[PDB]
Amino acid sequence: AFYLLYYTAKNXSA
Amino acid sequence: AFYLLYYTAKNXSA
């Protein structure tokens, strides 16, 4: 699985 | 700071 976490303002396990 | 982090096998701020 692809795990993605991000923080841009805004905070995103397939 | 902003950031993105990811994990798949691969493992990636301002």
Side-chain angles (χ1 to χ4, degrees):
Chain A
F2 173 53
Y3 301 83
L4 185 65
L5 270 178
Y6 68 87
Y7 175 56
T8 68
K10 191 77 192 181
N11 278 263
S13 293
Chain B
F2 316 126
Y3 61 84
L4 61 91
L5 292 170
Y6 62 90
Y7 184 80
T8 62
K10 293 280 175 180
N11 183 60
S13 58

